[PDB]
Amino acid sequence: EAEAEFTDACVLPAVQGPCRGWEPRWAYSPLLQQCHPFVYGGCEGNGNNFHSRESCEDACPVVDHHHHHH
């Protein structure tokens, strides 16, 4: 799959970063079961930061990235 057993972008919230500059990005929302655009800060952020609709939709929603469920 997308192998991401670590802190998966699909499982993580969007992160803006510590700055105050504003740059549009895409992040997956599990609470929305889908991606949406958001205001990112251009500086440091986590893996749930996509550059396009495309890349975010691959991040999810697709077949469940084989997470270590019970």
Side-chain angles (χ1 to χ4, degrees), residues 32-60:
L32 282 166
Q33 201 236 252
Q34 201 181 114
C35 278
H36 65 80
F38 79 106
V39 168
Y40 159 67
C43 70
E44 304 82 74
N46 301 24
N48 190 4
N49 184 290
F50 296 94
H51 310 307
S52 39
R53 179 67 170 163
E54 158 239 53
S55 55
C56 202
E57 298 339 274
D58 175 72
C60 278

Side-chain angles (χ1 to χ4, degrees), residues 5 18 20 57 60 62:
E5 283 313 301
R20 279 119 285 146
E57 298 339 274
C60 278
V62 201

Side-chain angles (χ1 to χ4, degrees), residues 9-36:
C10 189
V11 183
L12 170 92
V15 185
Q16 305 194 272
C19 300
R20 279 119 285 146
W22 301 130
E23 169 71 331
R25 287 293 181 270
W26 289 80
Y28 184 76
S29 286
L31 281 165
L32 282 166
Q33 201 236 252
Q34 201 181 114
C35 278
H36 65 80

